[PDB]
Write a protein that binds this DNA or RNA. Structure first.
Lengths: 50, 149, 116, 134, 77
RNA sequence: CCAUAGGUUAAUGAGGCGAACCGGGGGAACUGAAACAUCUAAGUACCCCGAGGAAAAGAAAUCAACCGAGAUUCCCCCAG
RNA sequence: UUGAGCCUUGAUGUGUAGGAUAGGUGGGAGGCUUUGAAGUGUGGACGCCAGUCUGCAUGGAGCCGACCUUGAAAUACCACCCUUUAAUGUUUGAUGUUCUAACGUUGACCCGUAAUCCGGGUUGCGGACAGUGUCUGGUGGGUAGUUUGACUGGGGCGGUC
RNA sequence: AGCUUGACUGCGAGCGUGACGGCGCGAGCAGGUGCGAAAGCAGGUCAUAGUGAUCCGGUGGUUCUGAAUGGAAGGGCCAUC
RNA sequence: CGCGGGGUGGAGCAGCCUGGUAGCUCGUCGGGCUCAUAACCCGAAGGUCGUCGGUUCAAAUCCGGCCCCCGCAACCA
RNA sequence: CGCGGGGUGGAGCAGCCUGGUAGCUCGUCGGGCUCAUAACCCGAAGGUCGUCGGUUCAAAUCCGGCCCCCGCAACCA
């Protein structure tokens, strides 16, 4: 649809990323969720990327 | 082309340097006239030993002789007979060899290819100043006289 | 620049406009001014007052050359023709000789029938 | 139009042939001579982009000879300038200190900077010509 | 025939590949030209059918030397 | 002008033919792809030039691999 | 001749505050002058025409930095550059004109030769054009190879997938 | 309505559904997380549509490989377009 | 039988597309100018948006049944 | 996806250049004026000069991210 898919890149040095969608026309702020990181096995914050 | 000269090319010729000219300029002009020669180790050996000694001045000895050819005819005013019509406008359009066969019959043993006519091919009747080519810069200005017969 | 000493002013006065240009004695133009570019659109375009400011704004733009004396060649009939030279007299120039070079034919091509 | 004193100074410098670090320090005494002891300023030309905010390079260096703490901050050109001390001191003193300068400049080497960093580093006295060293 | 008198570059065939790789038989022609060469020893002119690169071979080698090679193969110039 | 081009004579060799094979110069399509354009068919058919009894290639600016082997050609493996 | 890059060098750049047709920055307070000075004569370069700059010279050996109103200090000295620009050197390119040797010549003439083919030689006309090879953009049914679906109360149309 | 990110990572006995590719459910185990006093619940949304296989190529991570060796390019693996 | 379009003050056309507010011209009505009519100048009113129902916070508009008009098709034997 | 450069009064555009200057034409109103629509002229209202932050004595101009838009060339999963 018109819902763009984003790149939820980790905070830690590893390059592991989560992938999901986001309607930028509705929510103009970047996501700052907290998700699991499998290579260090811990819960850190994840930031927006394209 | 890294040709090495033999004569005095008027713009970059100093008799013996190894200048760089365009390919066409050498293969069509300098070579077939003997003004220069494509630089080969062999002829360069024959240059700074055999040619650059007196062979360099051999070409210039007759150059001084042509300076005398500059003035073979001391009168510098050759009379030629030509048929024409009224108010000028002569019978036939002459050529440069018209001068060649007339001047050698009364003086200068000149050929066709060395006489230069700056004023067309002379359609006007009277006394005009034609020029010769005995050298690259040495010029003789003989005033030929074409009068109606 | 060139600093040309003398010059010849030309005046093309027609019935609906006047385009005055200033050239030297050799014919090569050095600037001009019209009554149509000095505002005056329409009815005022064909007036002697418009011919006045045309001569003034042509008095400028030729300052780079600064010509002292001036030959005047007026051409064509109309509303300007006279107010353009008197304005050019007071423009500061030295009017040498005024002439009339109107193109009068000897019954050449045929003029239109227009106007009713 | 230039005057007598500065005339021979620029005539002493071959503006194209940039000198070695070994003897350029000795070439500034070839220029300097005034009523007061001058100092040498180091104009460092960097190839970074000053219009970008991600390339603001500035810092402080504690020079082992003093004049000492010397600060610096680049301009809207991508070229930064510093001074290192008075010219009346030892030649090798002047040699070793500027060496520590380019080390300090590479200390704050920008990550977004593309190309060779040190373009043309020129040192110059207050009343003398500018000599760029390799 | 389109044959360089010095180098002997005869026309070679190849393909005329398009974008979509549609091969179509084309032929490559040597850059031949008739030119009047001047031989110094014989003091006369010699017109040969030579290729552009062929002129450079006549340029580098001796013009009469390459002429010697032609008569060695038996083809009158 | 010399000189060459051109021309006459004498001496020697060549031309054409032949079933296949051989080297080089040009070089398809049907077909397969379940259509078809890349690709395949195949550098095959076919055409041309040349040569011999065989012809070709051939004595490494070849491989290999840090240990070695030694021109080329053909066959069996390597290996579908 | 005329563009562009670059080198050396000389200029170039007035909201307002204000003595200043001053861009940032910058080391530091002496340069300057008798390797012939401030003021002025006069032409020119630049000109938002406010005020810079300047060859020669009567003259004649002075001129002025922080100081002050400024966000800034004084091209008194100097450094790297931003804009605008000027002479030179240099580098090639795009045009114009002239020339002749390449090349063309289905122009005249002579020879090979009784041959309007052709080759060569004089001369004339064009002329580095033209034409040709390689690469390359466009056009291109002139030409070639092909595609142009299935379901379907026969097919086509419609609809469907 | 408050507090939060389980719209989690590695698996998964046992079943359902299909010719197959493939699709669906899943208690429970390990690391770690949120909520709750606690028992417990959460690996999306009441459920059933919202979607295309492969080849090729792109971006990021991983010395797995890397044709003489050491590296690299390029491949493989993982995530992802 | 089928495809596509349309139906809006009295007339001829926009706005539908992508839903909440309907405009242009002529005409009609009142006034003015002229002796008077026209033309011209000024002001104003006038539209169930074919019809019915549904979805929607809201329907001229999205969808469907039906009616009328228009174009296309209505074919091969 | 990559590239180029714009949003400027009711409209478009200049000013963006080398940073300190919001102007022009049509439009609205009032007035002068003609028989009169218009032409002409004066003046006024009308612009967060896309948005936020940063650099700066000052930015709409410079710089970065971004919303959107027009145009260009490429598109072999």
């Amino acid at each position: 649809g018109i819902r763009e898919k984003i790149k939820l890149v980790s905070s830690a040095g590893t390059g592991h990323f989560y992938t999901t969608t986001k309607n930028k026309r509705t929510k103009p702020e970047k996501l700052e969720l907290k998700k699991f990181d499998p290579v260090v096995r811990q819960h850190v914050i994840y930031k927006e990327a394209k | 082309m890294q040709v090495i000269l033999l004569d005095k090319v008027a713009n970059l010729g100093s008799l013996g340097d190894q200048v760089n000219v365009k390919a066409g300029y050498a293969r069509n002009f300098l070579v077939p006239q003997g003004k220069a020669v494509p630089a080969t180790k062999k002829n360069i050996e024959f240059f700074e030993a055999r040619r650059a000694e007196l062979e360099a001045k051999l070409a210039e000895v007759l150059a001084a002789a042509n300076a005398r050819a500059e003035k073979i005819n001391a009168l510098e005013t050759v009379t030629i007979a030509s048929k024409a019509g009224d108010e000028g406008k002569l019978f036939g359009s002459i050529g440069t060899r018209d001068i060649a066969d007339a001047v050698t019959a009364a003086g200068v043993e000149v050929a066709k290819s060395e006489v230069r006519l700056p004023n067309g091919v002379l359609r006007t009747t009277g006394e005009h100043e034609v020029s010769f080519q005995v050298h690259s810069e040495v010029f003789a200005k003989v005033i030929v006289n074409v009068v109606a017969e | 620049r060139k600093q040309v000493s003398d010059g010849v002013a030309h005046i093309h006065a027609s019935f609906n406009n006047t385009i005055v240009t200033i050239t030297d004695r050799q014919g090569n133009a050095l600037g001009w001014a019209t009554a149509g570019g000095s505002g005056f659109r329409g009815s005022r375009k064909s007036t002697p007052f418009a011919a006045q400011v045309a001569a003034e704004r042509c008095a400028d733009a030729v300052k780079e050359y600064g010509i002292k004396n001036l030959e005047v060649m007026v051409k064509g009939p109309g509303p300007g023709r006279e107010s353009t030279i008197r304005a050019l007299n007071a423009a500061g120039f030295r009017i040498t000789n005024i002439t009339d070079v109107t193109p009068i034919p000897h019954n050449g091509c045929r003029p239109p029938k227009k106007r009713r | 139009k230039l005057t007598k004193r500065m005339r021979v100074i620029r005539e002493k410098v071959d503006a194209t042939k940039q000198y070695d670090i070994n003897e350029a320090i000795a070439l500034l005494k070839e220029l300097a001579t005034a009523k007061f002891v001058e100092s040498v300023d180091v104009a460092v030309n960097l190839g970074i982009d000053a219009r970008k905010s991600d390339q603001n390079v500035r810092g402080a260096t504690v020079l082992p000879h003093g004049t000492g703490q010397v600060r610096y901050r680049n301009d809207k050109n991508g070229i930064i300038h510093t001074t290192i001390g008075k010219v009346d001191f030892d030649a090798d003193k002047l040699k070793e200190n500027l060496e520590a300068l380019l080390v300090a400049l590479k200390k704050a080497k920008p990550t977004q900077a593309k190309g060779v960093y040190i373009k043309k580093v020129s040192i110059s006295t207050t009343m003398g010509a500018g000599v760029a060293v390799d | 025939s389109r044959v360089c008198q010095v180098t002997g570059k005869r026309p070679v065939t190849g393909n005329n590949r398009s974008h979509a790789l549609n091969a179509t038989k084309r032929r490559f022609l040597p850059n031949l030209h008739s030119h009047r060469f001047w031989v110094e020893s014989e003091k006369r002119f010699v017109t040969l059918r030579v290729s552009a690169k062929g002129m450079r071979v006549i340029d580098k080698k001796g013009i009469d030397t390459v002429l010697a090679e032609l008569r060695a193969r038996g083809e009158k110039y």
